[PDB]
Amino acid sequence: TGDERFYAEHLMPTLQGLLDPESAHRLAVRFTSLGLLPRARFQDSDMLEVRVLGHKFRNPVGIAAGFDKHGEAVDGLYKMGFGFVEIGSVTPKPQEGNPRPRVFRLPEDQAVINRYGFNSHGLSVVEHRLRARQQKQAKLTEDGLPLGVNLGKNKTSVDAAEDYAEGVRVLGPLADYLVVNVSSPNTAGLRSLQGKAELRRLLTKVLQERDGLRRVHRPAVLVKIAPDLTSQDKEDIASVVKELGIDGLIVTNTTVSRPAGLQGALRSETGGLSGKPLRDLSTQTIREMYALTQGRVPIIGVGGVSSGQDALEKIRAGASLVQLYTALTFWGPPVVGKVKRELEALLKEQGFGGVTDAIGADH
Ligand SMILES: N#Cc1c(Oc2ccc(F)c(NC(=O)Cc3cccc(C(F)(F)F)c3)c2)ccc2nc(NC(=O)C3CC3)sc12
Numbered sequence: 001t002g003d004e005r006f007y008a009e010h011l012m013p014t015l016q017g018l019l020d021p022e023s024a025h026r027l028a029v030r031f032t033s034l035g036l037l038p039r040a041r042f043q044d045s046d047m048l049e050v051r052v053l054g055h056k057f058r059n060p061v062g063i064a065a066g067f068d069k070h071g072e073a074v075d076g077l078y079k080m081g082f083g084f085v086e087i088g089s090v091t092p093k094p095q096e097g098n099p100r101p102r103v104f105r106l107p108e109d110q111a112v113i114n115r116y117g118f119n120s121h122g123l124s125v126v127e128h129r130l131r132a133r134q135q136k137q138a139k140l141t142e143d144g145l146p147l148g149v150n151l152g153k154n155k156t157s158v159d160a161a162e163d164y165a166e167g168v169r170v171l172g173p174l175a176d177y178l179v180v181n182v183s184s185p186n187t188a189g190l191r192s193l194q195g196k197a198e199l200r201r202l203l204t205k206v207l208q209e210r211d212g213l214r215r216v217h218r219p220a221v222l223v224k225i226a227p228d229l230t231s232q233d234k235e236d237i238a239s240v241v242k243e244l245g246i247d248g249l250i251v252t253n254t255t256v257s258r259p260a261g262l263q264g265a266l267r268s269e270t271g272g273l274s275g276k277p278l279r280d281l282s283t284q285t286i287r288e289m290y291a292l293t294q295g296r297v298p299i300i301g302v303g304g305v306s307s308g309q310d311a312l313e314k315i316r317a318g319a320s321l322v323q324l325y326t327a328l329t330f331w332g333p334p335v336v337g338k339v340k341r342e343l344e345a346l347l348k349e350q351g352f353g354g355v356t357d358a359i360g361a362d363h
Pocket residue numbers: 011015021022024025027028029031032035036037038103112325326328329332333
């Protein structure tokens with residue numbers, strides 16, 4: 001907590017204090033690619049290991065899509081101590097994304113509103129960049145560090161499906177799992193791909209392009225869903241997942257809600273709210289979706305995580321894996337070691353074989 005406290009109290013406040021929220025994120029990425037980051041002196045205890053989507057996850061804590069959108073800072077993230085990395089979302093053709101401002105700090109509610117709108121260097125590039133490190137990722141994967149690739153759609157793309165397929169084509173080989181981003185609040189009518197008829201059509205075309213690749217190339221296909229769903233929405237996504245045999249789910253993306261009693265002086269700003277106020281929704285949606293999948297669909301639980309307890313709660317409500325992002329903004333890179341550390345604790349304390357032995361215990 002010594003190094004953790006110092007980042008939380010000083011190094012980060014003075015940074016996020018110094019720069020606008022975006023420039024801060026841009027620097028964090030670049031510093032991570034350059035390797036200007038501290039060495040996490042935490043060897044993962046055999047406990048935290050998890051197997052799912054047919055892979056070995058040394059630890060269940062991973063980075064969420066949106067930090068390394070273009071896949072520049074892959075190694076840095078692993079050294080940070082993440083058990084698995086998820087880059088993206090990536091778009092077929094490269095695009096500016098919405099204009100700045102587009103990242104806002106809510107210091108007071110330990111949260112963040114973002115409306116990036118899928119800024120991406122495009123598949124054509126990110127390919128070259130993953131192809132370049134093709135071989136080290138291989139070793140990293142079979143050593144227990146898998147790489148996920150989050151797929152998106154261009155602003156002015158009429159059929160998202162043709163967009164994604166093109167994603168599964170280009171980056172599916174170099175991926176150990178693909179996320180179908182269907183949950184971004186910051187792109188035109190994207191959330192309408194969570195609809196039964198439009199979701200089934202989408203994932204059928206994605207899997208058609210997927211099940212059209214060399215077996216060794218074949219990545220796990222997952223779907224990222226928003227925390228803001230009707231009682232109906234959830235059920236239909238559950239159905240269409242199982243119905244199609246989708247390898248797993250991510251739960252959740254950012255919320256367009258603004259939970260009553262946000263102190264953030266920027267809470268009115270348009271976009272997806274990450275961090276603390278999302279924690280509850282995310283877990284309630286990870287739970288509800290487990291019951292609906294009958295626990296038979298691997299859920300990666302993301303949203304609000306910044307502690308060992310935070311993570312556990314997701315794991316216990318169906319989370320086969322966990323992810324965090326917004327935390328970093330406030331806790332710095334040391335938050336990764338911190339969650340893992342405080343997890344081992346609240347596992348042993350409640351008497352659990354490892355992590356697998358707590359996956360959906362709340363059920
Ligand atoms: N993680 C993180 C993170 C962050 O910290 C980083 C990130 C990568 C690094 F490599 C280091 N390295 C060091 O600290 C070590 C060091 C090296 C050289 C000099 C010094 C010193 F200056 F101390 F001398 C110290 C620190 C900073 C801003 C930031 N913004 C975020 N997200 C958002 O803004 C919103 C989008 C959500 S995450 C984030």
